[PDB]
Design a protein around this ligand. Structure first.
Ligand code: HEM
Ligand code: HEM
Ligand SMILES: Cc1cc(N)nc(COc2cc(CCN(C)C)cc(F)c2F)c1
Ligand SMILES: Cc1cc(N)nc(COc2cc(CCN(C)C)cc(F)c2F)c1
Ligand SMILES: C[C@H](O)[C@H](O)[C@H]1CNc2nc(N)[nH]c(=O)c2N1
Ligand SMILES: C[C@H](O)[C@H](O)[C@H]1CNc2nc(N)[nH]c(=O)c2N1
Ligand SMILES: [Ca+2]
Ligand SMILES: [Ca+2]
Ligand SMILES: [Cl-]
Ligand SMILES: [Cl-]
Ligand SMILES: [Gd]
Ligand SMILES: [Gd]
Ligand SMILES: [Zn+2]
Lengths: 402, 399
């Protein structure tokens, strides 16, 4: 049999048949589960390529056609001659969508079919790379009506270095390692900040300074490019009823654009391929502003709210964190920037799981990452058993280039 | 040896104890299933537990050690099973708690009152042992941990089984509109009680009778005297209408349907109890959609905007229900603990166990509280889950 999966809210029971097609192995064994850990050749390339091609031809309802036979024979010939092959434009668009669709830790996959794919495979310098990224930022921001996008730079090939974007996201705020061990800014960005300074950037002293980009073109040190300020839409934060909240000086940016993951399609690897969507408010409200090792504002909000912070049993932390989340959502809706709260987000993911059960017979989901960081059991994904496994195409983590 | 990181702090440790995992869990390299709720060779298991026991008391390979080994050998040669000494039984009971991966309260594991009930026959004796337990553990609101071990399983004989999933359960009555009045979780046991001859109440908080089962007999209904079942009426420190909703819960969480395993012995009835973490009552029992599901009622009462999700009315209402649970238990002087204090104590347990055994089996999904996840330190702690023995285990229903 296949793993039987159960929804404890409704009683319903599914079987995940898709999980049998899992190739690459994860970190668990029958002796011990490591699900909570954040970070866990001509003939193998051929079998990956064959699998991907079969996938494309299934998607377009054409499996076994003449064009399917021929494209498989085409790919086989190019690998035999060059050791690699090239994706057709239509295969790249399909592959980027499949990689998103396959990402077990993404709760926003109800959208996986509405992804704009920018083909940058003919890029040949850091300067051209920057222009592709600004065009992406502009397209995806769209003055606050966010559109999902991905730009795909050239694939890894033997005898030439990779394109890399050094920044983990296109928009990040500086983190200045202060002298008393502290940090002014986003602590998560202290390393990439010190790297920007070392590469010529004149730093500021704010807590919300936008970092420039370090772009690495093949076989060359990274180059610094400053984003034009009019390109980075930002939301100042205010509370619908806590007027002093505005005085806190809080901002976040509109566009979540992950730039450091590797995209893998049919055996081919794209080291630089930034992708963006829109934010779920709990990423900003709970994790980015309340994580103790981030901006860590939970106590200061609670004190201002005049909460009794001397005993945990008053639940001051939970009260302040709710209200920080209200402010984020209210602020994005005020400035007409797309945003979704963790109730709608998780309820649309329940809709995605059910589409996927029908479409494919399963859905890779990492329960610990799909359940939001506040109000977990209040969302319906909490009560949904999930099966976690690796399908390809895929987005994968990769080493820092320095 | 799995590297385990804490992300708020940056500390690394190594779990060397996972190597001692005796049994197998549900996960494989192809797929992780940790989110799933329910995933004469007796000599080998008995020998291992003994080596454990004597190592724990610093008397390994000594005289008493080898004496007990040949003792159990001959006991199973003569009988087919063997008897635990009272001290080993105490030790196994504590170890099985200490090894429970889904329990956040294990900071307490050394302090547990073990009541030996292996000399029990008939359900009326069962019932007497059980009321002594409730009396000892409740202790007028100052709660104390306790377990009562009933006769082990042996060949050719029935088992002792407590049919109720807990010693204290509220009725769930199916209604002609389909819905349930009372606790929907308990609909199945509530008809079993009515079938074996219980007079149904009709409130949302009617305490069920006990369906106790002595070997090779049908179960017998027993009613708990109301003065023994201590209950907390729920009120809110500042929202004066909350009291009128009539919500209540009980004081003693007493699980009565898990099987206890020690040195290859199996105890199908060994009820244990502790005290409650507030979120168990406030969030899961009163607010799960398939339990009392009171969240919208409370939101309406708070005049929140319940027609749009982004007002976070579900979150604001949930917090205030937890606030009322905490305030009501403390006011009535019943032991309770909030999820912040509980998760910080589990962090201390992790450090202590890192030093005592080199690791600690922990099931992240059940350690992290169901509200305010990332607001507690366990959210940022990587965790390894595996099955040591002695253990507590789920087991099929008695029917
Ligand atoms: C359009 C709305 C989207 C929403 C609301 C959304 C939401 C999220 C959230 C909340 C996470 C977990 C983030 C974390 O805590 O680390 C996540 C992870 C992820 N998302 Fe999505 N996302 C969206 C679009 C996209 C797109 C367009 C892609 C790729 C084409 C994508 C790919 C991924 C991947 C690969 C991860 C896993 C990385 C990790 O471990 O954090 N998402 N997403
Ligand atoms: C004394 C304070 C205690 C606290 C605060 C506490 C807390 C908890 C909580 C919150 C859970 C998760 C329950 C759930 O929602 O599924 C749990 C599970 C568990 N606890 Fe504890 N507990 C305590 C005492 C005990 C004792 C005395 C024992 C046995 C001697 C024990 C053994 C277990 C076991 C076996 C589980 C697993 C049950 C399951 O899978 O749900 N606990 N505990
Ligand atoms: C496209 C997109 C949309 C969206 N709404 N959210 C995301 C979040 O994606 C990531 C976020 C982090 C930050 C780590 N987190 C603990 C704060 C690390 C990653 F590797 C990610 F892929 C991506
Ligand atoms: C001794 C003790 C103390 C304590 N504070 N909490 C517990 C909770 O124990 C269990 C709870 C559930 C219900 C799981 N969820 C529906 C709430 C199922 C089980 F099998 C359990 F053992 C036990
Ligand atoms: C240790 C733990 O696995 C880790 O903190 C995970 C848990 N779940 C998460 N879930 C999301 N969405 N994002 C995260 O960063 C994490 N962190
Ligand atoms: C599907 C998921 O495994 C299931 O809902 C689990 C998750 N975490 C939990 N955590 C606790 N404390 N209690 C539970 O019942 C559960 N249920
Ligand atoms: Ca070609
Ligand atoms: Ca009818
Ligand atoms: Cl982010
Ligand atoms: Cl309970
Ligand atoms: Gd105000
Ligand atoms: Gd009113
Ligand atoms: Zn696992």
């Amino acid at each position: 049999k296949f793993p039987r999966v159960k929804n404890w809210e409704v009683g319903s029971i599914t079987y995940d048949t898709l999980s049998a097609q899992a190739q690459q192995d994860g970190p668990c064994t029958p002796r011990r589960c490591l699900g909570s850990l954040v970070f866990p050749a001509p003939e193998q390339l051929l079998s990956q390529a064959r699998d991907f091609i079969n996938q494309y031809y299934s998607s377009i309802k054409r499996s076994g056609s003449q064009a399917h036979e021929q494209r498989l024979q085409e790919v086989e010939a190019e690998v035999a001659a060059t050791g690699t092959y090239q994706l057709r434009e239509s295969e790249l668009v399909f592959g980027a969508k499949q990689a998103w669709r396959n990402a077990p830790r993404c709760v926003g996959r109800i959208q996986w079919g509405k992804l704009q794919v920018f083909d940058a495979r003919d890029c040949r310098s850091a300067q051209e790379m920057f222009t592709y990224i600004c065009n992406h930022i502009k397209y995806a921001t769209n003055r606050g009506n966010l559109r999902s996008a991905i730009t795909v730079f050239p694939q890894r090939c033997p005898g030439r270095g990779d394109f890399r974007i050094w920044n983990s996201q296109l928009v990040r705020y500086a983190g200045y390692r202060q002298q008393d061990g502290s940090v002014r800014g986003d602590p998560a960005n202290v390393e990439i900040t010190e790297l920007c300074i070392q590469h010529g950037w004149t730093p500021g002293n704010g807590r919300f300074d936008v970092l420039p980009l370090l772009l690495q073109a093949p076989d060359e040190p990274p180059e610094l490019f400053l984003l034009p300020p009019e390109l980075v839409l930002e939301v100042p934060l205010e509370h619908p009823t806590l007027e002093w909240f505005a005085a806190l000086g809080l901002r976040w940016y509109a566009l979540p654009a992950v730039s450091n993951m590797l995209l893998e399609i049919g055996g081919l690897e794209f080291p630089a391929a930034p992708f963006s969507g829109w934010y779920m408010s709990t990423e900003i409200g709970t994790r980015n502003l309340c994580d103790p090792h981030r901006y860590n504002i939970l106590e200061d909000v609670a004190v201002c709210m005049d909460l009794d912070t001397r005993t945990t049993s008053s639940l001051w932390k939970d009260k302040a964190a709710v209200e920080i989340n209200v402010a984020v959502l209210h602020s994005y809706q005020l400035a007409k920037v797309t945003i979704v709260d963790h109730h709608a987000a998780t309820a649309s993911f329940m809709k995605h799981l059910e589409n996927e059960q029908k479409a494919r017979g399963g859905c890779p989901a990492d329960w610990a990452w799909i359940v939001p960081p506040i109000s977990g059991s209040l969302t319906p994904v909490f009560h949904q058993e999930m099966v976690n496994y690796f399908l390809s195409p895929a987005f994968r983590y990769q080493p820092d280039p320095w």
